[PDB]
């Protein structure tokens, strides 16, 4: 069309940090159409978008937030063929040296298995990790944010990532 198809932004939060990240994403998409959803209210609307941004903090040794984890079977019922998905994780890379932003792995594996494309892999430069489960092809499988230790890097990390994924968006 004349403009990008609407972007569906789906997030969860326990203590509110992720809300702020979503607000930053929305600001960078100020002039583009988006709709935002908290997956505590379910995931069914993911079916309705071709362009998606899925956001989760990490808990429980590399899991996504419970509202995502509880919906993984419903998520896997969706046909992701033709969808273009960016993944955003929040975590603490120093306190969780083997599970930083691990929650996005659960989302990645479902999107790919159900026919979707994941875009916006990011460099591991400037991050610390002992082991990871969120690398493919030498890159992190999404945007990895650390508001506890690297909050000053978040705005540029998000802005650069949004610019990249928009190039693949429908
Ligand atoms: C009990 C607990 C466990 C956590 N487990 C992880 C983890 O495995 N990996 C990670 O990267 N961050 C982990 N974190 C860090 C949180 O994901 C991070 O603080 C995030 O910004 C919280 O987002 P929220 O305020 O939106 O819930 C953990 C935090 C807490 C309190």
From TrEMBL:
Family membership noted in the UniProt record: Belongs to the flavodoxin family.
InterPro entries referenced in this protein's UniProt entry, alphabetically: Flavodoxin (IPR050619), Flavodoxin/NO_synth (IPR008254), Flavodoxin_lc (IPR010086), Flavoprotein-like_sf (IPR029039)
Record's keyword terms, sorted: Electron transport, Flavoprotein, FMN, Nucleotide-binding, Transport
Keyword Translocase: no
Cofactor requirements of the protein: FMN
Record function comment: Low-potential electron donor to a number of redox enzymes.
Keyword field contains Flavoprotein: yes
Domain Flavodoxin-like: 7-166
Organism the protein comes from: Fusobacterium nucleatum subsp. nucleatum (strain ATCC 25586 / DSM 15643 / BCRC 10681 / CIP 101130 / JCM 8532 / KCTC 2640 / LMG 13131 / VPI 4355)
Residues at which FMN binds: 13-15, 17-18, 58-59, 62, 92, 99, 101, 148
Protein's name in the database: Flavodoxin
GO molecular function: electron transfer activity; FMN binding
